UniProtKB/Swiss-Prot annotation, chain A:
Gene: RPT3
Compartments where found: Cytoplasm; Nucleus
Protein name per Swiss-Prot or TrEMBL: 26S proteasome regulatory subunit 6B homolog
Record PTM text: N-acetylated by NAT3.
Organism lineage string: Eukaryota, Fungi, Dikarya, Ascomycota, Saccharomycotina
Family according to the record: Belongs to the AAA ATPase family.
Native organism: Saccharomyces cerevisiae (strain ATCC 204508 / S288c) (Baker's yeast)
Main function: The 26S proteasome is involved in the ATP-dependent degradation of ubiquitinated proteins. The regulatory (or ATPase) complex confers ATP dependency and substrate specificity to the 26S complex.
Curated annotation (Swiss-Prot), chain B:
Protein localization: Cytoplasm; Nucleus
Assembly with partners or alone: May form a homodimer or a heterodimer with a related family member. Interacts with OLA1, TMA17, and UBR1.
Superkingdom assignment: Eukaryota
Post-translational modification comment from the UniProt entry: N-acetylated by NAT1.
Family to which the UniProt record says this protein belongs: Belongs to the AAA ATPase family.
Further comment found in the protein's record: Present with 4700 molecules/cell in log phase SD medium.
From-to range in the entire protein, with total length: 23 to 102 of 405
Protein name: 26S proteasome regulatory subunit 8 homolog
Length: 40, 80
């Protein structure tokens, strides 16, 4: 009731930290895309 | 605050919905850049000749005539 919901907070804060890693890499990744389909 | 647990539990899996939707976005998109980066790797690759068989020497050894030009005994690869 007061210890279980402490857990559910921190698993969320885990999740949000990776929701940006999956994102920003795409922002970092696409710069290789045209960088490569230009070299072609 | 006892209904705090109520609102949040739906907020979580509602949020996991898009992450699987994004984990699809990444891997589906990664395999794109794989190809072109594989393809471009090997248009730099060399040519490859053409020729015809006369007979076969004992094993792992055959002969070819390159159809404009002369003969060249050879070896073969793993597969054939």
């Amino acid at each position: 009731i007061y210890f279980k919901l402490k857990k559910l907070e921190k698993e969320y804060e885990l999740l949000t930290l990776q929701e940006d890693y999956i994102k920003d890499e795409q922002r970092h990744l696409k710069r290789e895309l045209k960088r490569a389909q230009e070299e072609v | 605050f006892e209904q705090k647990i109520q609102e949040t539990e739906l907020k979580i899996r509602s949020k996991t919905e898009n992450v699987r939707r994004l984990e699809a976005q990444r891997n589906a998109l990664n395999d794109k850049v794989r190809f072109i980066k594989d393809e471009l790797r090997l248009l730099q690759e060399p040519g490859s000749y053409v020729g015809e068989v006369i007979k076969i020497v004992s094993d792992k050894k055959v002969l070819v005539k390159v159809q404009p030009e002369g003969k060249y005994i050879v070896d073969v690869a793993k597969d054939i």
